Design an enzyme around this catalytic site. Sequence first.
Site, PDB file in Angstrom:
ATOM      1  N   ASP A 338       0.745  -2.973  -8.628  1.00  0.00           N
ATOM      2  CA  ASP A 338      -0.403  -3.853  -8.390  1.00  0.00           C
ATOM      3  C   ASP A 338      -0.765  -4.143  -6.936  1.00  0.00           C
ATOM      4  OD1 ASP A 338      -0.057  -6.193 -11.194  1.00  0.00           O
ATOM      5  OD2 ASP A 338       0.538  -4.081 -11.001  1.00  0.00           O
ATOM      6  N   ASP A 357      -2.034   0.427 -10.996  1.00  0.00           N
ATOM      7  CA  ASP A 357      -2.168  -0.672 -11.955  1.00  0.00           C
ATOM      8  C   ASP A 357      -3.238  -1.640 -11.454  1.00  0.00           C
ATOM      9  OD1 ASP A 357      -1.381  -3.064 -13.852  1.00  0.00           O
ATOM     10  OD2 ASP A 357      -0.158  -1.398 -14.548  1.00  0.00           O
TER      11      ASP A 357
END
Length: 549
Positions: A338, A357
């Site tokens: 992320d 992600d």
Amino acid sequence: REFMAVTANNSQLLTWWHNTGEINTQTPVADGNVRQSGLYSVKVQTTPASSSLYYDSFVYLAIPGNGMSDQLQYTQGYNQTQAWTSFLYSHDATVKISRNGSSANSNVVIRPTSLNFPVRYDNQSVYITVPYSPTGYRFSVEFDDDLISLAPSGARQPENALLIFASPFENSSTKPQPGSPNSIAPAPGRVLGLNTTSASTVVFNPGVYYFTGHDHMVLSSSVTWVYFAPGAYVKGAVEFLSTASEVKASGHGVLSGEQYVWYADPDEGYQKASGANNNGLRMWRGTLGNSSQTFVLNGVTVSAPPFNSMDWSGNSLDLITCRVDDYKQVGAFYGQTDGLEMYPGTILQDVFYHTDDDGLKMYYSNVTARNIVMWKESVAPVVEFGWTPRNTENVLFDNVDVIHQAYANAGNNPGIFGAVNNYLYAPDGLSSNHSTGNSNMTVRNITWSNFRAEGSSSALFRINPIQNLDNISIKNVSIESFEPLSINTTESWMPVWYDLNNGKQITVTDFSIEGFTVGNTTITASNAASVGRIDGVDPAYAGSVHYID
Ligand SMILES: *[C@@H]1O[C@H](CO)[C@@H](O)[C@H](O)[C@H]1NC(C)=O
Ligand SMILES: *[C@@H]1O[C@H](CO)[C@@H](O)[C@H](O)[C@H]1NC(C)=O
Ligand SMILES: *[C@@H]1O[C@H](CO)[C@@H](O)[C@H](O)[C@H]1NC(C)=O
Ligand SMILES: *[C@@H]1O[C@H](CO)[C@@H](O)[C@H](O)[C@H]1NC(C)=O
Ligand SMILES: *[C@@H]1O[C@H](CO)[C@@H](O)[C@H](O)[C@H]1NC(C)=O
Ligand SMILES: *[C@@H]1O[C@H](CO)[C@@H](O)[C@H](O)[C@H]1NC(C)=O
Ligand SMILES: *[C@@H]1O[C@H](CO)[C@@H](O)[C@H](O)[C@H]1NC(C)=O
Ligand SMILES: *[C@@H]1O[C@H](CO)[C@@H](O)[C@H](O)[C@H]1NC(C)=O
Ligand SMILES: *[C@@H]1O[C@H](CO)[C@@H](O)[C@H](O)[C@H]1NC(C)=O
Ligand SMILES: *[C@@H]1O[C@H](CO)[C@@H](O)[C@H](O)[C@H]1NC(C)=O
Ligand SMILES: *[C@@H]1O[C@H](CO)[C@@H](O)[C@H](O)[C@H]1NC(C)=O
């Protein structure tokens, strides 16, 4: 004498080198070594261009699995590698890229394509004229003969990427000045003692540093500033213990998580976490006290994160805010890598994200993010605001260029603007159950403007209204082309949702789309479905989705 790199260190240009560079594309490099690209050579010259000398700029290389073959299963399985180089400048400069002597000539495409930097081919090299800008530039140089097709999308991308990060000089706010108070400058090699130091500032001067795959940079409670000098390469992950008003990480050096296995758990000897416990090592971590804290992140390049790039610990995250600038994340081939958390009031700008992600995590209010280049890999939406119902308002994401996408299926939760399901009931984010929302919360006053998706793209949006939506505006979004219909990643949708406890229907109010184009076609209410592939808006919400033409 034998040839040697010559670096620049003047008022107009700064480049650096590493004498322990290691050409390696399959195994981990030595602790004190720095993986170097064996394919790309980069030199930089301050304009005006002339027969004058060009200065060598070290080209780093990140590879999937970081040389650990047993970790490849945690990546998408593509053979792409990612090289990059950074330099500081205060004047226009010519970047000279050279491949080996046997390589044939090939044109290149620079992304974002909106930059339009002059490019000339000569002497088996490529010359790119990079203009000076106080915000610098972060771009990808893609050789036509290096493009490959990524299955199953068929996306055409460099097999061996080369990123150029041209940044402005460091001022006294981002670089410890001479006589900086109470500082400590560790010597190259294994770094010890930072978790118990009485220092306020940690300075990493040019050189190679490492914490091994079984330790990380835990900074004592007195440390409020960690600096990565241009030319410094630190293998580790940062965790502040300070609960002070400000904790800062700056400098144009590199912080690399290449020594950590995917999902390395700091509480379990740094071995892969058990049962996806969400305790994978973050590259940036802090822990709040009972007072407000600002995380200033400036200039640093983060490479090879073993898990989510960043998360702060604390019961109340409303007291933390971020100030991010001129920051990059590269070589993020692992899943769940992320982008940063943008806590309340955050201002994030001039950033490059390579992520597999959630990219831009819109979870907090009063956030402004602009001038972002993203190389989206194969999982999660570009913008994410699902997982948990929230009260979020006043957000602006502007000038975001998604230069690449390579989704594979609906299960990857593809899409530029997405809000996946409730994590408490659908851990992987995709479920036909849309009755776990919260009718008492609302996401309001959101603006996503000037987004550009180059190459083949996933759907414009796949949004689950897990909480009420009000005043969300999409202004200017271009999709060059769509991924294949067969992989089910391009149709946009917004199904009707219901409250988990009382069954009240979640509402969508004033969701507007303006300046949406697919290739050379302008999208309107008339062709929203047939050309824009927006065919999944629930009939209950259809009247709330407006096409402003
Ligand atoms: C030379 O560069 C080409 C790409 O232009 C690469 O495919 C080739 O492997 C390189 N040669 C060697 C063996 O280093
Ligand atoms: C890398 O994968 C691509 C397909 O995505 C393939 O065309 C290419 O030949 C592969 N490269 C190598 C060295 O096997
Ligand atoms: C500081 O970190 C080291 C690992 O680098 C660890 O062995 C040591 O116990 C830590 N010291 C304290 C007081 O926690
Ligand atoms: C450039 O020169 C300055 C001043 O001597 C020095 O602090 C800095 O480390 C140099 N940069 C590099 C990495 O050569
Ligand atoms: C925060 O904690 C400190 C230290 O215990 C204390 O002195 C201060 O009063 C606390 N602030 C608040 C808002 O209670
Ligand atoms: C957002 O900023 C406003 C000030 O304009 C403030 O009143 C509000 O509390 C902030 N929202 C959050 C959740 O921080
Ligand atoms: C709405 O959000 C914007 C950011 O996009 C902010 O500047 C503005 O103050 C907010 N005001 C409202 C409620 O429209
Ligand atoms: C949807 O999920 C919730 C939460 O687990 C559950 O209570 C409810 O029975 C489910 N409804 C359906 C359609 O199965
Ligand atoms: C959308 O793009 C057009 C291009 O002509 C520009 O004039 C307009 O300002 C842009 N809208 C926003 C909100 O940036
Ligand atoms: C796309 O995926 C969704 C959810 O898995 C599924 O309901 C839908 O039928 C798929 N699209 C098609 C028609 O293949
Ligand atoms: C628009 O794009 C389509 C698909 O790339 C192409 O076939 C067509 O010739 C283009 N039309 C114009 C006017 O550019």
